[PDB]
Design a protein around this nucleic acid. Structure first.
Lengths: 186, 52, 125, 104, 47, 147, 52
RNA sequence: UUACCGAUACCAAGCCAUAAAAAGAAGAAAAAAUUUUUUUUUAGAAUCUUUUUAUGAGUAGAAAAUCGUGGGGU
RNA sequence: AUUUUAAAAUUAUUUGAAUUUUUCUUCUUAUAAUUUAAGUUGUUUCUAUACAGUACUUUCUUAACCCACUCGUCUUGAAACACGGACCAAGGAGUCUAGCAAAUGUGCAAGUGUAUAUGAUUCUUUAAACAUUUUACGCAUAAUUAAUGUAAUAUGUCUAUUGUAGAUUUGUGCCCCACUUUGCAUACAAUACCGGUAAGCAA
RNA sequence: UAAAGCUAAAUAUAUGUAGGAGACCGAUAGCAAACAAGUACCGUGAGGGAAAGAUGAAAUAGUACUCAGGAAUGAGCAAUUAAAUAGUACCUGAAAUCGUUAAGAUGGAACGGAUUAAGAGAGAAAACAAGUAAAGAGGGGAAU
């Protein structure tokens, strides 16, 4: 008998393997696991970790946010482990070198028309195997509507969680506990 | 020959799948071992280390 | 008790039997984990029907091979024996039960000229 | 492009008409491509993964030497043929052929 | 990237053709398998 | 699907994962939304705060077509029209685009976002927001009311 | 008791179906895959085989 | 006061699994006969391979990996 | 198959030194070997000069020493003087549909799903597949108010609010490090702006 | 433009009849009923309501003949069949339960765990001998 925590076995949390059985993504994961092991590059380690993540942690990054994040250094290349989506609110693009998992058709067309280029992660591993001049970016991992229902329960004081309701008219979840005139408010 | 017509090249009115774009790939060339053996990343790799 | 035959250690023989299968006919001896509440065997009371556990597992260097230090491979015709042409030292062959007498003879002669040993060589003759 | 040797191995490591598991003696898995010299289910031995590969197999009772585009021919002859279509592996093939020759 | 066209007598090759770009799509055995199971469910007769 | 079900993995476990003590009985708390305000009140108040009571006046028969109006913000007006024509209207300063958002399916133009500086644009819509009009004529454009 | 209102069919995304068809054609175009599926194609000249 | 006996605990060693870790995408070794033969092997599957260390009760309950049965594609 | 290496120790020669002054004194100079290094090796017998026995492997049956209460269950507590079970076979229990969410996989992405339906040399299979003359509908893309309604920096600038940490990137001291440069996600706050309510004014 | 009237199609069909199918059930299942089934049988009545399929290719092969028996049966040196231990309760023929033979144990339970020992059954795929020379049967490959 020995008095250890968790009986002496180190416990890790989070993903350990790719779940997607996409052969191309499996090949990419193999390549970047090898790259992360054989080079010291935290760049490659981060990319190898992010290729493994669920969909909700590879959110899209719009063109406007891409070109805003890459404003100050214009000759670098931006690498996103999500998808790049178009932004109709953006009036003009400018000469972006972007590596990404996937591009929507509109975003790809706009980037090539602006004269930049779209890169896959195998091309990124070919040309910048260490990540020189490569800026790691990610989209908003907490903007999705599911997070709007998370956190403190709707009903706890000063809670911002969205409740689960069929509809959102005046007669749905809006009388008692949501205004001072009916018992209390939140 | 009709495959190009059906899937977007040389479009004709009643044959081409309307507004359909052929799926693109996550990778550009899946020869990951050729990219690994390319000299740019071979120069990038650190020296082989040893196990326990 | 463990038995040793060269490098082969069998950590236990006399395979585990289901609790009370000795004194109940409707209880077959095939092992079942006693879920129970006051179950003696589940509680690991002394002197009764110990349960299997992973600790009995055999050394994985010698885990699946037969008393001839060869892995068994079961074949149904002559075409399934091609891979053994370059595995003849570490694999032995066994003819499937539902193979007729001609295919049996053909398999035996092909295995002999491949010098691959056969386990059930004298069946149906 | 679209395909690669690694991608083919990814597609065919599990689903294959040539894979024989060992259900009874659990440890073996054999790959029996026409171009698999040793029958290991391995990207380095799989003839449908390798770009070029030569081996010898018996077909309808006759030993035939095969080269991968997909050429077929009927010991000195095998040595000459291996020299003609050659890309350790050679010696392994020679010994495999000499073992094949002893088959009725 | 071209493919030779053969005659109904295999002994001959007639004018070659260019390989359609649809042959360059990702091969995607997982996607094919899942779509196949969902699709093949659609011809079942009730019981 | 049935061979992936969790009950299959409790096949010889007596209680089927439902407790040896509490058991799996039928409606031990009531049916549907029974106990709100009485014995499910913590759940109702913790997850559905404003559930009970009524607020507001009745609208007897609604006819949603009367008050239906989809909205668009000013920052998407330029993206409404194609890229090449956007470039044309940008390069040429004597011409402006006239966009009838009602044809695209929008009835009201809202004022969120930023329009391009010194780029005139005429917008036709059934309804306009105050700030939407302010931005449109701040960039040298015009709002036209249609119906 | 088995009922007739079981979910007999499945609605499949049109884009996913088209993707599957395109990928099946692409797979038919590569020799190792046609060999691995079970066809005895060791003797045909090229795998994207087209005749007059 | 000594010696001794005495656990599924402790110590050294082996093996199984669990967890973690170090690391990894190509060349002849021996032996037996008589320079020439013969016998074995001559590896490279990434949820993989090699090696290392620690660890292992368990109801209710949870999960993973496995084992079977009717029927359907391949 | 590129650490059972190197070192360490020992032996035999060898160079110098030191010292406890020497037949195991120590420290290196070089070479050659060894193992005390760098987890068991050798010899002789037997099995046996057999083809399955009186031996060896194995199953079973019997003893013998030590141990061993009837399972399932409710229960704080069951071997219970608690209940169910004479025996055996076969059957026998978290499923199906609707709806919601989370998780994960997949496609597409400010969109997405072509609903009912239509067409079309497909009409064993086929009740499935295939297709849809450049604002059908759902959900999403905007909130808020009982409500008339109103509706997100704001044209000084295609710019993209402000901080504190922070991934990545850039330099100077292709691989450690302190300052530089950039500042993702996110967290904590600050600011604006939208709807409602108050308050002040109110043509 | 009420207090009068008619009107086809697109729609529904656990009924009846007739076609066609199926990732359905496979004789304790599937309808209650695969069969002489809403039958036998029960209840005054309204009603309730089963069990029960399979020899063999062919009985246009369903057991002839003899012996012993009152007979049923049995046995055969007799007989159909590929087969009668397929003989009409007839395919296969499990378990509970019982019989015969053999072996063993046996002082108010029996069985068991763990370790061996003695018996008794089986067994050679590691549990010795590759090659070498001869003669006998064979099989293949290359060489004109």
């Amino acid at each position: 008998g020995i008095a250890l925590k968790n009986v002496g076995r180190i416990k890790k949390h989070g993903r350990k393997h790719l779940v997607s059985k996409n052969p191309y993504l499996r090949l990419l994961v193999k390549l970047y696991n090898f790259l992360a092991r054989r080079t010291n590059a935290n760049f490659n380690k981060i990319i190898a970790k992010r290729l493994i993540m669920p969909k909700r942690y590879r959110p899209p990054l719009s063109l406007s946010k891409l070109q805003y994040h890459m404003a100050n250094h214009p000759n670098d290349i931006a690498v996103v482990v999500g998808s790049i989506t178009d932004d109709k609110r953006l009036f003009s693009l400018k000469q972006l070198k972007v590596c990404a998992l996937r591009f929507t058709e509109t975003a790809r067309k706009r980037i090539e028309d602006a004269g930049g280029e779209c890169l896959t992660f195998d091309q990124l591993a070919l040309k910048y195997p260490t990540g020189k001049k490569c800026v790691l970016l990610r989209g908003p991992t907490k903007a999705r509507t599911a997070e709007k229902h998370f956190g403190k329960a709707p009903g706890k004081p000063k809670s911002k969680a969205r409740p689960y309701v069929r509809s959102k008219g005046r007669k749905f979840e809006k009388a008692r506990g949501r205004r001072k005139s009916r018992a209390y408010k939140k | 020959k009709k495959l190009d017509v059906i899937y977007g090249k040389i479009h004709e009115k009643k044959v081409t799948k309307k507004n359909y774009i052929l799926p693109k790939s996550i990778v550009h060339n899946p020869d990951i071992y050729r990219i690994i053996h390319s000299d740019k990343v071979q120069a990038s790799l650190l020296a082989k280390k040893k196990p326990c | 008790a463990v038995k040793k035959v060269g490098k082969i250690i069998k950590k236990r023989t006399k395979k585990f039997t289901r609790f009370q299968s000795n004194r109940f006919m409707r209880v077959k001896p095939a092992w079942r984990k006693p879920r129970g509440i006051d179950c003696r065997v589940r509680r690991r009371y002394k002197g009764t029907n110990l349960m299997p556990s992973i600790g009995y597992g055999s050394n994985k260097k010698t885990k699946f091979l037969l008393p001839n230090n060869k892995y068994k491979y079961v074949v149904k015709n002559v075409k399934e024996m091609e891979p053994l042409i370059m595995n003849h030292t570490k694999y032995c062959v066994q003819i499937a039960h539902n193979v007729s007498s001609k295919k049996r003879k053909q398999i035996i002669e092909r295995a002999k000229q491949m010098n691959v040993s056969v386990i059930n060589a004298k069946a149906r003759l | 492009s679209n395909v690669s040797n690694a991608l083919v191995w990814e597609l065919t490591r599990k689903s294959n008409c040539f894979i024989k598991k060992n259900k009874a003696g659990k440890k073996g898995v054999f790959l029996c491509d026409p171009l698999n010299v040793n029958y290991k289910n391995t990207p380095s031995s799989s003839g449908l993964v390798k770009s070029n590969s030569t081996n010898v197999t018996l077909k309808d009772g006759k030993v035939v030497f095969s080269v991968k585009v997909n050429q077929h021919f009927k010991m000195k002859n095998v040595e000459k043929l291996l020299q003609q279509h050659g890309s350790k592996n050679k010696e392994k093939l020679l010994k495999k052929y000499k073992r094949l020759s002893k088959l009725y | 990237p071209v493919a030779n066209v053969y005659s109904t007598n295999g002994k001959n090759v007639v004018g070659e053709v260019e390989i359609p770009v649809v042959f360059q799509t990702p091969i995607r055995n997982d996607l094919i398998q899942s779509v196949y199971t969902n699709m093949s469910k659609n011809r079942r007769h009730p019981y | 699907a049935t061979r992936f079900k969790k009950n299959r993995k409790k096949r010889g476990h007596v209680s089927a994962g439902h407790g040896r003590v509490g058991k799996h009985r039928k409606h031990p708390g009531g049916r549907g939304k029974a106990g709100g305000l009485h014995h499910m009140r913590i759940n109702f108040d913790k997850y559905h705060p404003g559930y009970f009571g009524k607020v507001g006046m009745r609208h007897l028969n609604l006819l949603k077509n009367r008050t239906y109006c989809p909205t668009i913000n000013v920052d998407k007006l330029w993206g409404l029209l194609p890229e090449e024509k956007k470039k044309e209207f940008s390069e040429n300063k004597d011409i402006a685009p006239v966009i009838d958002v009602t044809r695209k399916g929008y009835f009201k133009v809202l004022g969120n976002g930023k329009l391009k500086h010194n780029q005139p644009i005429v917008v036709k819509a059934r309804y306009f927001s105050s700030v939407a009009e302010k931005k449109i004529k701040a960039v040298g454009g015009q709002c036209i009311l249609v119906a | 008791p088995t009922k007739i209102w079981r979910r007999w069919g499945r609605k499949v995304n049109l884009k996913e179906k088209r993707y599957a068809v395109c990928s099946s054609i692409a797979a038919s175009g590569v020799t190792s895959l046609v060999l691995a599926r079970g066809h005895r194609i060791s003797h045909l000249k090229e795998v994207p085989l087209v005749v007059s």
